From a paper:
A majority of the potent neutralizing antibodies target the receptor binding domain (RBD) of the spike protein. ADI-62113 is a potent cross-neutralizing antibody isolated from a COVID-19 patient. Notwithstanding, our findings here illustrate that antibodies with a YYDRxG pattern in their CDR H3 have the capability to target a highly conserved surface in sarbecovirus RBDs and can neutralize SARS-CoV-2 VOCs including Omicron, and SARS-CoV, indicating a common convergent solution available to the human humoral immune system to counteract sarbecoviruses.
To understand the basis of the broad reactivity of ADI-62113, we determined the crystal structure of ADI-62113 in complex with SARS-CoV-2 RBD at 2.6 Å resolution. Despite differences in heavy chain and light chain variable germline gene usage, the binding mode of ADI-62113 to the SARS-CoV-2 RBD was similar to COVA1-1611. The somatically mutated VH R100b has multiple interactions with the RBD where its aliphatic moiety interacts with the aromatic ring of F377, and its guanidinium group forms three hydrogen bonds with the backbone of RBD 369YNS371 and the partially negative dipole at the C-terminus of a short α-helix in the RBD, as also observed in COVA1-1611. VH G100d has a positive phi (φ) angle (φ = 88°, ψ = 11°), consistent with a glycine residue in a G1 β-bulge, that alters the backbone conformation and enables a hydrogen bond to be made between its carbonyl oxygen and the hydroxyl of the highly conserved RBD S383. Importantly, the YYDRxG motif contributes a combination of polar, hydrophobic, and amide-π interactions with the CR3022 site, providing a structural basis for the potent and broad neutralization against SARS-CoV-2, VOCs, and other SARS-related sarbecoviruses. All of these RBD epitope residues are highly conserved across all 169 sarbecovirus sequences analyzed and are largely not changed in SARS-CoV-2 variants, which supports the broad-spectrum cross-reactivity observed for ADI-62113 against sarbecoviruses. Even although their epitopes do not overlap with the receptor binding site, they can sterically compete with binding of human ACE2 receptor, which may in part explain their relatively high potency as non-RBS antibodies in neutralizing SARS-CoV-2 and VOCs.
Numbering used by the authors:
A (entry chain H): 1 to 52, 52A, 53 to 82, 82A, 82B, 82C, 83 to 100, 100A, ...
B (entry chain A): 334 to 527
C (entry chain L): 1 to 94, 96 to 211
Write the structure that this text describes.
């Protein structure tokens, strides 16, 4: 099976550089062009460049030429992209995608086949002057159907995973998208709707995991 | 990845003895250090294994049993013991391998009028077998005449409520108990310490 | 440089409706245009390649047409699993992606269930108070959330976050967070959340006293 495995998320300060990896499996990595496409949060897809390993054919976009470079190691079946002179606007998810093989037609003209049939899972690159910080978890307590939740406040960088009751409680849970505050730190809310009869009976614990900071917090949301 | 011990120890209230709660712990990594380093426990006795050697050990399944008894009944949560709790409510096996953990809960399970929500089985025709639970509400025949499903003279409801009051003595105060049982079977061990 | 536009920018249609979105290139890009689908939180997926060719594993309700500068993408019967943003992409010369078209499911109007949460004692010890208002399972997405502190409208201290359309009931949920200092929190009493939504016969206010 074709699989494009990308490197883990990266956090960088403005001006620094980042090197991302895209390991290919399940196909002849040498003969297929691999494109690099990025996507700012909530923004459109943006093509950056392509590179074919066996050919050495390389083409960058005008916006990233001079600060970008795409190489490959055919032995490791891995394509590398390196973006330099990073700025806050480079904060995005960077995908590697495999295109079809280019061809010649009846008259001898070279045609590319740059439709992306296989994508990697993407690598998040956060560029910010903020330093890595773990979240503080505060209970959102209830007073028919009741609502309770947790406040994941003042953490950096994204993301955070929030589960309820060690993974058991999943129905009625709404983990909201994070928002970037002016302090440069993220804040997030996770809520769940439960029956008011169960407000007593069941114990409700939210489990917050911030892998960037190796911070795991288990907070119980009890009615005050 | 991390075993859900906090769901058991730090729950808002515990079960009654007769309907003791059991949590099946599986496919996770357990750090018993959060338990054997705390000074919050009035009773921490382990049988067949030391708590210190638990963090480098592996078991197939681990069970966490929960209930609330009164203080002078905590000694009954031990192998080969007798009493209303051991005989009619919660019995440990004689070859029991695990830990008995208890702490006072007068601040949580006692009310000014009295917390009558915690119950225990007062009458039973036979003694419980190890790790057996009876949530029945059948009328008990304490005499010759049959009850036939209705309460009456020498025909009693089997369960009785602890009257947990904050002004009670320590032996009559509520105590929260967690019994960890460690099961090692001819199967892949799935609950492992660090 | 080749420019690629998409119309409409956003779209709402009921289940089973025929949906057609367009894509326009600034130059003749022949048939070298592909269509991608990106569900929320996932990577893009190729559905139509070279204007008309459906890719393997993609349902037959998806189609594509166009040549030269004008191209079209059609969903014959909109399904709830088709909530996503759809991009077109040319490759006649280099690669240029489109701005994208957000496709949503038009559902019956559903009013929100509103909840307000006071600041926790743990956070008040930190010197900061955060009041959180929750709007649960509502459609359409547009809703006004007004923070009223002693019936005084609060501005500049609020932040909002909306979930994506749910997999089952096709609804939205909204979280608003009012962050104050402990000093500013203790100089006021009534903290309220006023919510206006099409599914409500009148604004609903959830409040608490400090
Ligand atoms: C059971 O809870 C205690 C105490 O938890 C604290 O108080 C609760 C009301 C809730 O607000 C928790 O989030 C609090 O942490 C746990 O003991 C704490 O463990 C943390 C872990 O790092 C430590 O920082 C604290 O100092 C501990 N507090 C005390 C009073 O000991 C305990 O670990 C929980 N038990 C289990 C099995 O998870």
């Amino acid at each position: 099976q074709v699989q494009l495995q990308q490197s883990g998320a990266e956090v960088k300060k403005p001006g620094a550089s980042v090197k991302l990896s895209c390991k290919a499996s399940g196909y002849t990595f040498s003969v297929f062009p691999i494109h690099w496409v990025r996507q700012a949060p909530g923004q459109r897809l943006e093509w950056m460049g392509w590179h074919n390993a066996g050919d050495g054919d390389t083409k960058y976009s005008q916006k990233f030429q001079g600060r970008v470079t795409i190489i490959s190691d055919t032995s490791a079946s891995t394509a590398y992209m390196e973006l330099s002179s990073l700025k806050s606007e480079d904060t995005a998810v960077y995908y590697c995608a495999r295109a079809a093989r280019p061809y010649y037609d009846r008259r001898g003209y070279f045609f590319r086949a740059d439709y992306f049939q296989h994508w990697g899972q993407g690598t998040l690159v956060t560029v910010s002057s903020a330093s890595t910080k773990g979240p503080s978890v505060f209970p959102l307590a209830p007073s028919g159907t009741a609502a309770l939740g947790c406040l994941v406040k003042d953490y950096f960088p994204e993301p955070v995973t929030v589960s309820w009751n060690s993974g058991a409680l999943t129905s009625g849970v709404h983990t909201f998208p994070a928002v970037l505050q002016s302090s440069g730190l993220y804040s997030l809310s996770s809520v769940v709707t439960v029956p008011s009869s169960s407000l007593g009976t069941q114990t409700y614990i939210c489990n917050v995991n911030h892998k960037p900071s190796n911070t795991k917090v288990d907070k119980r949301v009890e009615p005050k | 990845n991390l075993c859900p011990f906090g769901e058991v120890f730090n729950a808002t209230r515990f079960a009654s003895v007769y309907a003791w709660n059991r949590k099946r712990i599986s496919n996770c990594v357990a750090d018993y250090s959060v338990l054997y380093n705390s000074a919050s426990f009035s009773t921490f006795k382990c049988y067949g294994v030391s708590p210190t050697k638990l963090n480098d050990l592996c078991f197939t399944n681990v069970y966490a049993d929960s209930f609330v008894i009164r203080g002078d009944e905590v000694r009954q949560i031990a192998p080969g013991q007798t009493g209303k709790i051991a005989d009619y409510n919660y019995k440990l096996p004689d070859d029991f391998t695990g830990c008995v953990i208890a702490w006072n809960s007068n601040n949580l399970d006692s009310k000014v009028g009295g917390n009558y929500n915690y119950l225990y089985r007062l009458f039973r025709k036979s003694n419980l077998k190890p790790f057996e639970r009876d949530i029945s509400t059948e009328i008990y025949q304490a005499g010759s005449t049959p009850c036939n499903g209705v309460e009456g003279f020498n025909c009693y409801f089997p369960l009785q409520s602890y009257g947990f009051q904050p002004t009670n003595g320590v032996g009559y105060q509520p105590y929260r108990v967690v019994v960890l049982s460690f099961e090692l079977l001819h199967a892949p061990a799935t609950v492992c310490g660090p | 440089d080749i420019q690629v536009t998409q119309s409409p920018s956003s779209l709402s249609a009921s289940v089973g409706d025929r949906v057609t979105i367009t894509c326009q290139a600034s130059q003749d890009i022949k048939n070298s245009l592909n269509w991608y689908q990106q569900k929320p939180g996932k990577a893009p997926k190729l559905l139509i390649s070279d204007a008309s060719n459906l890719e393997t594993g993609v349902p037959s309700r998806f189609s594509g047409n166009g040549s030269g500068t004008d191209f079209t993408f059609t969903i014959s019967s909109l399904q709830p699993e088709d909530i996503a943003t759809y991009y077109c992409q040319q490759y006649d010369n280099l690669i240029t992606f489109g701005p994208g078209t957000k496709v949503e499911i038009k559902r019956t109007v559903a009013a929100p269930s509103v909840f307000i949460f006071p600041p926790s004692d743990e956070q008040l010890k930190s010197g900061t108070a955060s009041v959180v208002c929750l709007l649960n399972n509502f459609y359409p997405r547009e809703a006004k959330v007004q923070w009223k502190v002693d019936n005084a409208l609060q501005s500049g201290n609020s932040q909002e976050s909306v979930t994506e359309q749910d997999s089952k009931d096709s609804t939205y949920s909204l979280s608003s967070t009012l962050t104050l200092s402990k000093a500013d929190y203790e100089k006021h009493k009534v903290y309220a959340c006023e919510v206006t939504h099409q599914g409500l016969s009148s604004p609903v206010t959830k409040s608490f006293n400090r």
